[PDB]
């Protein structure tokens, strides 16, 4: 529906931060996926970031390579907003990537950017991305939702 109602949407950040970012033993091709984060309650639907400090291919190697999977969905295919940026040493938001556009996500499915930040000026002291060696990610991930609102307050049903 582009002209008229849009509806609710479910979102919620989660701070990643990476102590001894700089100590990675990664390949250029491995990747380091974090655990589950949820909006709050233990939803069925969960996330997971792949960053990728030693790079993925030749080409951003130099760079990192950060992308968002979805560890695990309870409907087939789900749509969502995803943001990744950097908090400096005094957490503030710096060389972050934010697109206005949902992109399909399903079970195994990774999306993201292959060029994110030169991993050269993270570990540069002018910005000070890694006071002590730590990556800060701040990720941000927003579900669309049509005014749907699930209410529980059910029966004990106990005995």
Known sequence: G???SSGKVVKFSYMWTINNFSFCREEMGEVIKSST??????????WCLR?????????????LSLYLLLVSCPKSEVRAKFKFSILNAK???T?????????????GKDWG???FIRRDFLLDEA?????????????EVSVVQDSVNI????GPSSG
């Open 127 to 139: 910005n000070g991305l890694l006071p002590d060696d730590k990556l800060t990610l701040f990720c």
């Open 51 to 63: 960053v990728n400090p030693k790079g993925l291919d030749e080409e951003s190697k130099d760079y």
């Open 95 to 107: 060389k972050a990537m934010e697109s206005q556009r949902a992109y399909r996500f399903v079970q």
């Open 151 to 154: 209410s529980g307050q059910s």
């Open 91 to 93: 957490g503030e938001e």
């Open 113 to 115: 950017f292959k060029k």
């Open 37 to 46: 984060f949820s909006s709050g309650a233990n939803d069925k639907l969960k």
């Open 2 to 4: 582009s002209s008229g």
